[PDB]
Amino acid sequence: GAPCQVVLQGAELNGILQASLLDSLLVMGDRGILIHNTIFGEQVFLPLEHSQFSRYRWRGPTAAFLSLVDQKRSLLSVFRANQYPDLRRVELAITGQAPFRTLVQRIWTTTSDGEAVELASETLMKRELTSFVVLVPQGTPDVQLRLTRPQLTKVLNATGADSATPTTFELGVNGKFSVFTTSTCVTFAARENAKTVYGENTHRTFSVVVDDCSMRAVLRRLQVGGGTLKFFLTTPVPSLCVTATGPNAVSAVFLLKPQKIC
Amino acid sequence: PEDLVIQISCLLYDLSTTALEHVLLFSLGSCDLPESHLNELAARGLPTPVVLEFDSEFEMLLAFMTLVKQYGPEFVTGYNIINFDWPFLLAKLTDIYKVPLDGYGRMNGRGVFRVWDRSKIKVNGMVNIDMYGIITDKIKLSSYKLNAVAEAVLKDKKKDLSYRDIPAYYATGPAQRGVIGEYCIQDSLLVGQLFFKFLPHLELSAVARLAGINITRTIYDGQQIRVFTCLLRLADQKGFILPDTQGRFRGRHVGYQGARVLDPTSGFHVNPVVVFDFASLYPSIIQAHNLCFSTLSLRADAVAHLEAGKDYLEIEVGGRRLFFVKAHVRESLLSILLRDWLAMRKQIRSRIPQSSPEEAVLLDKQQAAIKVVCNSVYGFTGVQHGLLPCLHVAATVTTIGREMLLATREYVHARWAAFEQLLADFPEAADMRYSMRIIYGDTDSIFVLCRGLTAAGLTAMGDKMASHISRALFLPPIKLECEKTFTKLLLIAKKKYIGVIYGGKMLIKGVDLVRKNNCAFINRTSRALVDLLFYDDTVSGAAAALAERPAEEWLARPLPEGLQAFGAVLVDAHRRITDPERDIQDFVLTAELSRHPRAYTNKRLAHLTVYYKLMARRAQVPSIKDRIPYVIVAQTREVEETVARLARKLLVSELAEDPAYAIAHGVALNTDYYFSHLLGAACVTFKALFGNNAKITESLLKRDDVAARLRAAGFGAVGAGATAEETRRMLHRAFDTLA
DNA sequence: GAATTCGAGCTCGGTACCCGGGGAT
DNA sequence: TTCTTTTGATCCCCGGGTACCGAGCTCGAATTC
């Protein structure tokens, strides 16, 4: 079909619908789509691999779309919880030349007797940005630990309120994971019951420090169900990434100020 | 009794030769005028000041009134002499000294010597022309202080003495009292210059001569007694009589339906926009259609013996059928009346060049006067509980006005829709090459956006178009005429637009650069922006490019590469607003009081706030139509506590200091407010570029600290600031870095 | 119960009036 | 004791105010993999 083509028929689309994120940026290309947004001053990402579509096909340089088509609607609003009840399928077809591509989104709802009505009242058309640059995370973390809903809920409870009281994810020797602040402190065991988190490269102790306490708001909006907590410190500015293990892989990088010590 | 008059300057000109004859200075106590001032007077040829010294205030005021009686100046003037000078003096002479002024006019007694607070004054046989009121209706200024008016009209940077500095001076010897006397004389010399620039007596006497009222009723009593007297003359000739109704008589509400304001196709129009409009619209309707009281018939019997359409007009006004019989049945008093005024309007202009230099100046003030009577007729009929009203005539005038605006629009849309029909009417269009759509209109004007036609000869054919329309549609006294041609127009809103007339001047119509609210800072930068938009090419290109996208697409995309200088001005203004020299005369807002501060219902206005702050500190309380200058001072814990003391985030009506205070006490300005209002003025104007979306415009005008720390964190950039290969190779580095 | 739904309840701007008032046309 | 007139209407925009109201946005507890 048209040159770059991303199709979600049913039964792989059900995973993507199962996976704030409307006024976003959609950096499509090879290896998939990256959905980037800024909430509260932090950078939140949602990768969507090329294997993770019923058909993903790309020809040309990567393209980047604002999600708000005509500044209200959204190219991801299709994948919402209950926006279109009877939806089955979406195709994203891109057609143009490298400085100017446009992407069109058609919708397909189930009928009886195995067919689909195209809701041509609500198809979307966007134009490739025609100038953009994003700053995506890179490399791999220093040490990453997997958590759960109750675990992650309580560690987010431990963290601060405003700039007065900076928090710190130190990991001590032989399983002293700790997310404290002055007047609240929580701790886990790191294995390679109920405070025994699993992870890898657990020997890599530190004590990171954050000055900006928007982590709680940020990661509560996305309603993360517990996931990876990844630390990145071989940069002048350490950053911590958080990736829910629920239906989605929605991640959020938070910048830990340069005051890195163990 | 202790707040006394100290000096009275009194210049005595000759009204005919305009020659200053005497310069008198009444002075309580010694007064030695400085030599520099005496020599400036002798240098300019002016008489030498005759300083008269007194012991007591009563003697000084008695000698002033004695001169007023003996010399008996037929005309008196001054600046603000009806709100301060005469009320101050007369309050002294009646309250304190109990002098009867009934004989100090021209009659030896039993004459009127009274002030009213417009605030009038009626001395008998003495025509008081306060130049304050003459200048507020001949110049649009934010401040009408005599220094600002002197600079703006006379090009005379005067030095003002503030009343707070007069006690310190007066206490010293005669030499400082002489300094006060010099500032007094110079004020009156400036007012004499203003009077002889404007020559209000000549224009107002042309009006008094034509109306039938004396000159003092012309200066003071309003527009209705002129019309009533002119009508009364006509009526008494024709055999009519004007009933009294008002003799038994005494919220944005309206009496009848006004005029039509077509919907603008807002936006930046870089094509020619011919502006037709009717000359003397409503007077021409009154004359064309023979509208009057004496020609109206509410009932269809009075005309039951007359042909319809041939002997009488019949029009639905307010859902009431109204019959206005035509001339050759009865000449509508209002039509007859207007014929004379309209004839003089054009006649004088034609014979102005055919006159002496002095006679040309006479026809200047005189003709301008005959233009006031033309529009005065319409208001007379539609004033409710005014003298001799008829809202049937006034509503008929506006009804025909609305019909004509639409009739003209439909004629233009039907006849000249294709260029062949335009060429058939006007062969001179052949060298001017399309569409021709009215994109705006107002009570009489229509803005015809002529696409495909050159702006060069478009007014010369617009005259012929206008004659064509006026011949085809309207009755003889009515006349549409092409008055402008904009080579660029920014139709902002209904009564708002900017546009550069053809090969020429900028016309700014009600877009707050022409409004007396704002501070010179916001006006200066707003003007800078509109000059960029209109004159500076490569910003008119970018601005005309902004319409190729719907407004919300600019919230995502980078704005066209020309408009950058349009934000450089804003950026500079942001710098300039915070800079700590910030002379706060650039930041002085104003507002007119316009009614007693008790007659407001919304008493939470900034100028009322500052009015009461001025009356609280015993400073000079403004008058009902003064302008009340004020700054918006920064919200500070002290200001907060003071406002609650006189009683969060304070309102702008509670951060409403006046500039004299805010300099004396070094109160600092509210940078937040003044910049938000700078951007507000920019947004109000330039929302027309962005689909009239003030929201989108605001966002795009208010358009680091993330890119910094990312470049610090070893993220390379991929996009603008590198060659395309460098962005590709870094994109490779990222994709293999994540994978 | 542990997730899990949309369900029900908060608040938090947003927009639009709604309005008076300035001050144009 | 103290005043004691005069054109008309239309229109946008701002400041000060109110009042929904959808959007989020988490909690709280029936229905439940």
PDB file of N, CA, C and O in Angstrom, chain B residues 231-278:
ATOM      1  N   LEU B 231     -35.132  74.834  13.932  1.00  0.00           N
ATOM      2  CA  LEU B 231     -36.435  74.290  13.611  1.00  0.00           C
ATOM      3  C   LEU B 231     -37.531  75.264  13.935  1.00  0.00           C
ATOM      4  O   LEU B 231     -38.541  75.305  13.246  1.00  0.00           O
ATOM      5  N   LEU B 232     -37.369  76.030  14.996  1.00  0.00           N
ATOM      6  CA  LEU B 232     -38.403  76.955  15.403  1.00  0.00           C
ATOM      7  C   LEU B 232     -38.531  78.076  14.397  1.00  0.00           C
ATOM      8  O   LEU B 232     -39.637  78.485  14.065  1.00  0.00           O
ATOM      9  N   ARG B 233     -37.408  78.540  13.869  1.00  0.00           N
ATOM     10  CA  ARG B 233     -37.437  79.518  12.795  1.00  0.00           C
ATOM     11  C   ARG B 233     -38.196  78.984  11.594  1.00  0.00           C
ATOM     12  O   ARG B 233     -39.122  79.633  11.086  1.00  0.00           O
ATOM     13  N   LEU B 234     -37.835  77.779  11.141  1.00  0.00           N
ATOM     14  CA  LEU B 234     -38.540  77.183  10.007  1.00  0.00           C
ATOM     15  C   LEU B 234     -40.028  77.001  10.272  1.00  0.00           C
ATOM     16  O   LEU B 234     -40.863  77.352   9.433  1.00  0.00           O
ATOM     17  N   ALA B 235     -40.376  76.420  11.408  1.00  0.00           N
ATOM     18  CA  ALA B 235     -41.767  76.168  11.737  1.00  0.00           C
ATOM     19  C   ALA B 235     -42.575  77.453  11.714  1.00  0.00           C
ATOM     20  O   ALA B 235     -43.625  77.516  11.076  1.00  0.00           O
ATOM     21  N   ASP B 236     -42.101  78.493  12.409  1.00  0.00           N
ATOM     22  CA  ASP B 236     -42.847  79.742  12.442  1.00  0.00           C
ATOM     23  C   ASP B 236     -43.014  80.339  11.061  1.00  0.00           C
ATOM     24  O   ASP B 236     -44.023  80.989  10.800  1.00  0.00           O
ATOM     25  N   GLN B 237     -42.073  80.127  10.154  1.00  0.00           N
ATOM     26  CA  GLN B 237     -42.349  80.568   8.791  1.00  0.00           C
ATOM     27  C   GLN B 237     -43.482  79.758   8.182  1.00  0.00           C
ATOM     28  O   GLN B 237     -44.423  80.320   7.623  1.00  0.00           O
ATOM     29  N   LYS B 238     -43.392  78.435   8.253  1.00  0.00           N
ATOM     30  CA  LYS B 238     -44.345  77.604   7.538  1.00  0.00           C
ATOM     31  C   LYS B 238     -45.746  77.622   8.131  1.00  0.00           C
ATOM     32  O   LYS B 238     -46.693  77.247   7.440  1.00  0.00           O
ATOM     33  N   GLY B 239     -45.908  78.093   9.348  1.00  0.00           N
ATOM     34  CA  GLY B 239     -47.191  78.081   9.990  1.00  0.00           C
ATOM     35  C   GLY B 239     -47.366  76.892  10.895  1.00  0.00           C
ATOM     36  O   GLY B 239     -48.467  76.374  10.992  1.00  0.00           O
ATOM     37  N   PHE B 240     -46.326  76.499  11.613  1.00  0.00           N
ATOM     38  CA  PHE B 240     -46.379  75.371  12.511  1.00  0.00           C
ATOM     39  C   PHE B 240     -46.052  75.871  13.899  1.00  0.00           C
ATOM     40  O   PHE B 240     -45.635  77.010  14.085  1.00  0.00           O
ATOM     41  N   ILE B 241     -46.243  75.011  14.886  1.00  0.00           N
ATOM     42  CA  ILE B 241     -45.901  75.339  16.255  1.00  0.00           C
ATOM     43  C   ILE B 241     -45.448  74.074  16.946  1.00  0.00           C
ATOM     44  O   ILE B 241     -45.957  72.989  16.702  1.00  0.00           O
ATOM     45  N   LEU B 242     -44.498  74.234  17.813  1.00  0.00           N
ATOM     46  CA  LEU B 242     -43.751  73.133  18.376  1.00  0.00           C
ATOM     47  C   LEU B 242     -44.285  72.847  19.763  1.00  0.00           C
ATOM     48  O   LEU B 242     -44.113  73.691  20.629  1.00  0.00           O
ATOM     49  N   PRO B 243     -44.979  71.739  20.024  1.00  0.00           N
ATOM     50  CA  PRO B 243     -45.567  71.574  21.347  1.00  0.00           C
ATOM     51  C   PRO B 243     -44.512  71.474  22.420  1.00  0.00           C
ATOM     52  O   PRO B 243     -43.373  71.100  22.161  1.00  0.00           O
ATOM     53  N   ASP B 244     -44.915  71.766  23.648  1.00  0.00           N
ATOM     54  CA  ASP B 244     -44.102  71.416  24.793  1.00  0.00           C
ATOM     55  C   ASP B 244     -44.575  70.065  25.267  1.00  0.00           C
ATOM     56  O   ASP B 244     -45.774  69.822  25.391  1.00  0.00           O
ATOM     57  N   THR B 245     -43.630  69.198  25.533  1.00  0.00           N
ATOM     58  CA  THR B 245     -43.890  67.951  26.232  1.00  0.00           C
ATOM     59  C   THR B 245     -42.958  67.912  27.418  1.00  0.00           C
ATOM     60  O   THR B 245     -43.331  67.452  28.493  1.00  0.00           O
ATOM     61  N   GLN B 246     -41.765  68.460  27.241  1.00  0.00           N
ATOM     62  CA  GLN B 246     -40.725  68.380  28.250  1.00  0.00           C
ATOM     63  C   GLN B 246     -41.092  69.196  29.477  1.00  0.00           C
ATOM     64  O   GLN B 246     -40.617  68.910  30.584  1.00  0.00           O
ATOM     65  N   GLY B 247     -41.923  70.220  29.292  1.00  0.00           N
ATOM     66  CA  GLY B 247     -42.394  71.013  30.405  1.00  0.00           C
ATOM     67  C   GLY B 247     -42.958  70.185  31.548  1.00  0.00           C
ATOM     68  O   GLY B 247     -42.867  70.600  32.708  1.00  0.00           O
ATOM     69  N   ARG B 248     -43.570  69.031  31.249  1.00  0.00           N
ATOM     70  CA  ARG B 248     -43.968  68.091  32.293  1.00  0.00           C
ATOM     71  C   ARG B 248     -42.860  67.056  32.662  1.00  0.00           C
ATOM     72  O   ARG B 248     -43.127  66.176  33.488  1.00  0.00           O
ATOM     73  N   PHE B 249     -41.582  67.264  32.296  1.00  0.00           N
ATOM     74  CA  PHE B 249     -40.639  66.127  32.289  1.00  0.00           C
ATOM     75  C   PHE B 249     -39.311  66.378  33.002  1.00  0.00           C
ATOM     76  O   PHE B 249     -38.858  67.511  33.201  1.00  0.00           O
ATOM     77  N   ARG B 250     -38.611  65.253  33.182  1.00  0.00           N
ATOM     78  CA  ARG B 250     -37.391  65.144  33.964  1.00  0.00           C
ATOM     79  C   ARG B 250     -36.167  64.979  33.085  1.00  0.00           C
ATOM     80  O   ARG B 250     -35.048  64.930  33.592  1.00  0.00           O
ATOM     81  N   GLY B 251     -27.087  50.570  33.292  1.00  0.00           N
ATOM     82  CA  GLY B 251     -28.059  50.231  32.277  1.00  0.00           C
ATOM     83  C   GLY B 251     -27.689  50.867  30.955  1.00  0.00           C
ATOM     84  O   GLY B 251     -27.655  52.086  30.832  1.00  0.00           O
ATOM     85  N   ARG B 252     -27.347  50.017  29.993  1.00  0.00           N
ATOM     86  CA  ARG B 252     -27.076  50.408  28.624  1.00  0.00           C
ATOM     87  C   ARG B 252     -28.335  50.180  27.800  1.00  0.00           C
ATOM     88  O   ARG B 252     -28.478  49.166  27.108  1.00  0.00           O
ATOM     89  N   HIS B 253     -29.283  51.093  27.953  1.00  0.00           N
ATOM     90  CA  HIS B 253     -30.551  51.051  27.248  1.00  0.00           C
ATOM     91  C   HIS B 253     -30.622  52.081  26.122  1.00  0.00           C
ATOM     92  O   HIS B 253     -30.092  53.184  26.211  1.00  0.00           O
ATOM     93  N   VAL B 254     -31.338  51.693  25.077  1.00  0.00           N
ATOM     94  CA  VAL B 254     -31.424  52.343  23.779  1.00  0.00           C
ATOM     95  C   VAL B 254     -32.886  52.620  23.461  1.00  0.00           C
ATOM     96  O   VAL B 254     -33.776  51.912  23.927  1.00  0.00           O
ATOM     97  N   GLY B 255     -33.141  53.654  22.682  1.00  0.00           N
ATOM     98  CA  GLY B 255     -34.497  54.057  22.399  1.00  0.00           C
ATOM     99  C   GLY B 255     -35.088  53.452  21.148  1.00  0.00           C
ATOM    100  O   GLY B 255     -36.294  53.282  21.070  1.00  0.00           O
ATOM    101  N   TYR B 256     -34.264  53.141  20.164  1.00  0.00           N
ATOM    102  CA  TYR B 256     -34.693  52.554  18.898  1.00  0.00           C
ATOM    103  C   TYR B 256     -33.468  51.886  18.292  1.00  0.00           C
ATOM    104  O   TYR B 256     -32.391  51.909  18.879  1.00  0.00           O
ATOM    105  N   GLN B 257     -33.597  51.373  17.089  1.00  0.00           N
ATOM    106  CA  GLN B 257     -32.572  50.534  16.496  1.00  0.00           C
ATOM    107  C   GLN B 257     -31.647  51.372  15.629  1.00  0.00           C
ATOM    108  O   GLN B 257     -32.098  52.132  14.779  1.00  0.00           O
ATOM    109  N   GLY B 258     -30.362  51.250  15.888  1.00  0.00           N
ATOM    110  CA  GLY B 258     -29.344  52.052  15.276  1.00  0.00           C
ATOM    111  C   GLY B 258     -28.991  51.486  13.942  1.00  0.00           C
ATOM    112  O   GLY B 258     -29.857  51.040  13.203  1.00  0.00           O
ATOM    113  N   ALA B 259     -27.722  51.460  13.630  1.00  0.00           N
ATOM    114  CA  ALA B 259     -27.264  51.143  12.303  1.00  0.00           C
ATOM    115  C   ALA B 259     -26.670  49.751  12.292  1.00  0.00           C
ATOM    116  O   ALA B 259     -26.453  49.132  13.320  1.00  0.00           O
ATOM    117  N   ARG B 260     -26.467  49.260  11.087  1.00  0.00           N
ATOM    118  CA  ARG B 260     -25.980  47.922  10.828  1.00  0.00           C
ATOM    119  C   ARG B 260     -24.465  47.976  10.755  1.00  0.00           C
ATOM    120  O   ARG B 260     -23.894  48.900  10.183  1.00  0.00           O
ATOM    121  N   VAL B 261     -23.818  47.009  11.367  1.00  0.00           N
ATOM    122  CA  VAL B 261     -22.376  46.840  11.287  1.00  0.00           C
ATOM    123  C   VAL B 261     -22.174  45.459  10.693  1.00  0.00           C
ATOM    124  O   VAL B 261     -22.410  44.459  11.358  1.00  0.00           O
ATOM    125  N   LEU B 262     -21.861  45.392   9.408  1.00  0.00           N
ATOM    126  CA  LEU B 262     -21.647  44.103   8.780  1.00  0.00           C
ATOM    127  C   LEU B 262     -20.523  43.351   9.478  1.00  0.00           C
ATOM    128  O   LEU B 262     -19.682  43.917  10.173  1.00  0.00           O
ATOM    129  N   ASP B 263     -20.558  42.045   9.327  1.00  0.00           N
ATOM    130  CA  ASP B 263     -19.580  41.176   9.946  1.00  0.00           C
ATOM    131  C   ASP B 263     -18.284  41.246   9.152  1.00  0.00           C
ATOM    132  O   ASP B 263     -18.311  41.006   7.946  1.00  0.00           O
ATOM    133  N   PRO B 264     -17.150  41.598   9.755  1.00  0.00           N
ATOM    134  CA  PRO B 264     -15.904  41.588   9.003  1.00  0.00           C
ATOM    135  C   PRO B 264     -15.428  40.181   8.686  1.00  0.00           C
ATOM    136  O   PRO B 264     -15.639  39.244   9.454  1.00  0.00           O
ATOM    137  N   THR B 265     -14.819  40.021   7.514  1.00  0.00           N
ATOM    138  CA  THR B 265     -13.951  38.872   7.302  1.00  0.00           C
ATOM    139  C   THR B 265     -12.605  39.308   7.847  1.00  0.00           C
ATOM    140  O   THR B 265     -11.762  39.858   7.145  1.00  0.00           O
ATOM    141  N   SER B 266     -12.457  39.138   9.150  1.00  0.00           N
ATOM    142  CA  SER B 266     -11.249  39.545   9.837  1.00  0.00           C
ATOM    143  C   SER B 266     -10.019  38.945   9.182  1.00  0.00           C
ATOM    144  O   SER B 266     -10.087  37.916   8.512  1.00  0.00           O
ATOM    145  N   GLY B 267      -8.899  39.632   9.337  1.00  0.00           N
ATOM    146  CA  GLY B 267      -7.647  39.132   8.831  1.00  0.00           C
ATOM    147  C   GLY B 267      -6.818  40.183   8.159  1.00  0.00           C
ATOM    148  O   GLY B 267      -7.256  41.320   7.994  1.00  0.00           O
ATOM    149  N   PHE B 268      -5.601  39.808   7.804  1.00  0.00           N
ATOM    150  CA  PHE B 268      -4.691  40.662   7.069  1.00  0.00           C
ATOM    151  C   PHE B 268      -4.986  40.473   5.597  1.00  0.00           C
ATOM    152  O   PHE B 268      -4.841  39.376   5.060  1.00  0.00           O
ATOM    153  N   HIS B 269      -5.491  41.527   4.991  1.00  0.00           N
ATOM    154  CA  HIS B 269      -5.857  41.626   3.595  1.00  0.00           C
ATOM    155  C   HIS B 269      -4.788  42.454   2.917  1.00  0.00           C
ATOM    156  O   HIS B 269      -4.701  43.654   3.145  1.00  0.00           O
ATOM    157  N   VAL B 270      -3.950  41.808   2.115  1.00  0.00           N
ATOM    158  CA  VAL B 270      -2.919  42.514   1.370  1.00  0.00           C
ATOM    159  C   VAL B 270      -3.394  42.951  -0.004  1.00  0.00           C
ATOM    160  O   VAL B 270      -2.626  43.580  -0.734  1.00  0.00           O
ATOM    161  N   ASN B 271      -4.612  42.622  -0.386  1.00  0.00           N
ATOM    162  CA  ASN B 271      -5.184  43.109  -1.627  1.00  0.00           C
ATOM    163  C   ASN B 271      -5.843  44.460  -1.414  1.00  0.00           C
ATOM    164  O   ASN B 271      -6.064  44.876  -0.279  1.00  0.00           O
ATOM    165  N   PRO B 272      -6.144  45.189  -2.487  1.00  0.00           N
ATOM    166  CA  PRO B 272      -6.796  46.486  -2.318  1.00  0.00           C
ATOM    167  C   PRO B 272      -8.160  46.348  -1.683  1.00  0.00           C
ATOM    168  O   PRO B 272      -8.910  45.429  -1.979  1.00  0.00           O
ATOM    169  N   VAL B 273      -8.504  47.320  -0.859  1.00  0.00           N
ATOM    170  CA  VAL B 273      -9.786  47.376  -0.189  1.00  0.00           C
ATOM    171  C   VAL B 273     -10.297  48.782  -0.422  1.00  0.00           C
ATOM    172  O   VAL B 273      -9.904  49.711   0.273  1.00  0.00           O
ATOM    173  N   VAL B 274     -11.144  48.948  -1.419  1.00  0.00           N
ATOM    174  CA  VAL B 274     -11.808  50.223  -1.656  1.00  0.00           C
ATOM    175  C   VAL B 274     -12.873  50.441  -0.599  1.00  0.00           C
ATOM    176  O   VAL B 274     -13.678  49.556  -0.335  1.00  0.00           O
ATOM    177  N   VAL B 275     -12.869  51.593   0.036  1.00  0.00           N
ATOM    178  CA  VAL B 275     -13.858  51.914   1.057  1.00  0.00           C
ATOM    179  C   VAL B 275     -14.822  52.917   0.477  1.00  0.00           C
ATOM    180  O   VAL B 275     -14.506  54.094   0.395  1.00  0.00           O
ATOM    181  N   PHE B 276     -15.985  52.466   0.073  1.00  0.00           N
ATOM    182  CA  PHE B 276     -17.012  53.433  -0.238  1.00  0.00           C
ATOM    183  C   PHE B 276     -17.632  53.911   1.056  1.00  0.00           C
ATOM    184  O   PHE B 276     -17.578  53.216   2.057  1.00  0.00           O
ATOM    185  N   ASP B 277     -18.254  55.090   1.025  1.00  0.00           N
ATOM    186  CA  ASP B 277     -19.152  55.455   2.107  1.00  0.00           C
ATOM    187  C   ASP B 277     -19.971  56.667   1.707  1.00  0.00           C
ATOM    188  O   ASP B 277     -19.579  57.447   0.851  1.00  0.00           O
ATOM    189  N   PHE B 278     -21.158  56.744   2.266  1.00  0.00           N
ATOM    190  CA  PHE B 278     -22.066  57.839   1.985  1.00  0.00           C
ATOM    191  C   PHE B 278     -21.600  59.135   2.604  1.00  0.00           C
ATOM    192  O   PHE B 278     -21.135  59.168   3.738  1.00  0.00           O
TER     193      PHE B 278
END
